[PDB]
Amino acid sequence: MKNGEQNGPTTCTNCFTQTTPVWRRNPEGQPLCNACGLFLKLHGVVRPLSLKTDVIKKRNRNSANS
DNA sequence: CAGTGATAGAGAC
DNA sequence: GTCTCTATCACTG
Ligand SMILES: [Zn+2]
């Protein structure tokens, strides 16, 4: 079990990010963090990966329910 | 239960 | 005062 950590540490092949709320994918099958998957897919052009950070800003949450 | 697409908000200068 | 990037939500099988 354990998986080599995550056998092939889910590491953004685009920005090395290891921490992320969810993992995205690309029609090529390469693993990507949510930011690159969201930004890369929406922009379609290379991006200064220098924007990435090891800290993620926590936003609020629409407390659904009743 | 998990993942995707779409929209909106906040921060900095 | 304005722009941008990123995260979360809702929905479905
Ligand atoms: Zn990434």
Short mmCIF file of C-alpha atoms (C1' of nucleotides) and ligand atoms in Angstrom, two decimals:
data_model
loop_
_atom_site.label_atom_id
_atom_site.label_comp_id
_atom_site.label_asym_id
_atom_site.label_seq_id
_atom_site.Cartn_x
_atom_site.Cartn_y
_atom_site.Cartn_z
CA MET A 1 0.00 0.00 0.00
CA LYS A 2 1.32 3.54 0.79
CA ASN A 3 2.16 3.65 -2.95
CA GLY A 4 5.78 4.99 -3.34
CA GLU A 5 4.49 7.94 -1.27
CA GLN A 6 2.14 8.34 -4.25
CA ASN A 7 4.20 6.01 -6.57
CA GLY A 8 5.16 8.74 -8.99
CA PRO A 9 4.52 11.51 -6.43
CA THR A 10 1.63 13.39 -8.01
CA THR A 11 3.93 16.25 -8.92
CA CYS A 12 2.76 18.85 -11.41
CA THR A 13 4.89 18.05 -14.46
CA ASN A 14 4.24 21.74 -15.23
CA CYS A 15 5.04 23.50 -11.89
CA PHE A 16 6.18 20.69 -9.52
CA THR A 17 3.34 21.64 -7.13
CA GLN A 18 2.79 18.68 -4.75
CA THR A 19 0.04 20.29 -2.63
CA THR A 20 -3.32 20.95 -4.32
CA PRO A 21 -7.12 20.72 -3.60
CA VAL A 22 -7.50 18.51 -6.70
CA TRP A 23 -5.46 17.00 -9.55
CA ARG A 24 -6.31 17.77 -13.22
CA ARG A 25 -5.29 15.86 -16.37
CA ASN A 26 -4.50 16.68 -20.02
CA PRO A 27 -5.53 14.69 -23.19
CA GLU A 28 -1.89 13.42 -23.10
CA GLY A 29 -2.32 11.73 -19.69
CA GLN A 30 0.24 13.90 -17.82
CA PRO A 31 -0.68 14.79 -14.17
CA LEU A 32 -1.20 18.54 -13.49
CA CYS A 33 -2.12 20.62 -10.42
CA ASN A 34 -5.40 22.57 -10.52
CA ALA A 35 -3.74 25.93 -11.31
CA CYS A 36 -1.84 24.76 -14.43
CA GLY A 37 -4.80 22.67 -15.60
CA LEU A 38 -7.11 25.67 -15.11
CA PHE A 39 -4.73 28.39 -16.35
CA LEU A 40 -2.97 26.37 -19.08
CA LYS A 41 -6.24 25.04 -20.53
CA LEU A 42 -7.89 28.50 -20.39
CA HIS A 43 -4.84 30.40 -21.75
CA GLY A 44 -3.37 27.75 -24.11
CA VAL A 45 0.12 29.39 -23.99
CA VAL A 46 3.28 28.91 -21.89
CA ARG A 47 3.22 30.87 -18.59
CA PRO A 48 6.00 32.18 -16.25
CA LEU A 49 5.84 29.28 -13.78
CA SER A 50 7.54 31.79 -11.44
CA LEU A 51 4.00 32.70 -10.31
CA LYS A 52 3.45 29.32 -8.61
CA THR A 53 4.10 29.30 -4.83
CA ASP A 54 4.36 26.69 -2.04
CA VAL A 55 1.55 28.50 -0.18
CA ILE A 56 -2.09 28.32 -1.36
CA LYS A 57 -4.49 31.13 -0.43
CA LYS A 58 -7.56 29.68 1.30
CA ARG A 59 -10.74 31.32 -0.02
CA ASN A 60 -14.09 31.30 1.75
CA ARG A 61 -16.65 28.58 1.04
CA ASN A 62 -20.33 28.94 0.21
CA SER A 63 -21.62 27.15 3.30
CA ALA A 64 -24.39 25.38 1.37
CA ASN A 65 -26.80 23.26 3.44
CA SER A 66 -29.69 24.96 5.30
"C1'" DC B 1 -17.76 9.31 -3.85
"C1'" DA B 2 -14.78 11.64 -7.35
"C1'" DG B 3 -13.76 14.83 -11.10
"C1'" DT B 4 -14.84 18.56 -14.56
"C1'" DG B 5 -16.20 23.31 -16.35
"C1'" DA B 6 -17.58 27.84 -15.30
"C1'" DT B 7 -17.96 31.83 -12.76
"C1'" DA B 8 -16.65 35.20 -9.39
"C1'" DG B 9 -13.69 37.48 -5.76
"C1'" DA B 10 -9.63 39.39 -3.76
"C1'" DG B 11 -5.02 41.61 -3.72
"C1'" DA B 12 -1.35 44.75 -5.47
"C1'" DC B 13 0.42 48.91 -7.64
"C1'" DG C 1 -9.15 52.88 -9.83
"C1'" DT C 2 -8.28 48.83 -12.64
"C1'" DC C 3 -6.41 44.32 -13.98
"C1'" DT C 4 -5.39 39.45 -13.32
"C1'" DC C 5 -4.94 34.74 -11.36
"C1'" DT C 6 -6.61 31.25 -8.59
"C1'" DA C 7 -10.15 28.52 -5.77
"C1'" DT C 8 -14.34 27.00 -4.96
"C1'" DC C 9 -19.30 25.43 -6.23
"C1'" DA C 10 -22.69 22.59 -8.62
"C1'" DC C 11 -23.78 18.65 -11.34
"C1'" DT C 12 -23.52 13.69 -13.01
"C1'" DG C 13 -22.57 8.49 -13.31
ZN ZN D 1 0.96 23.13 -11.72
#
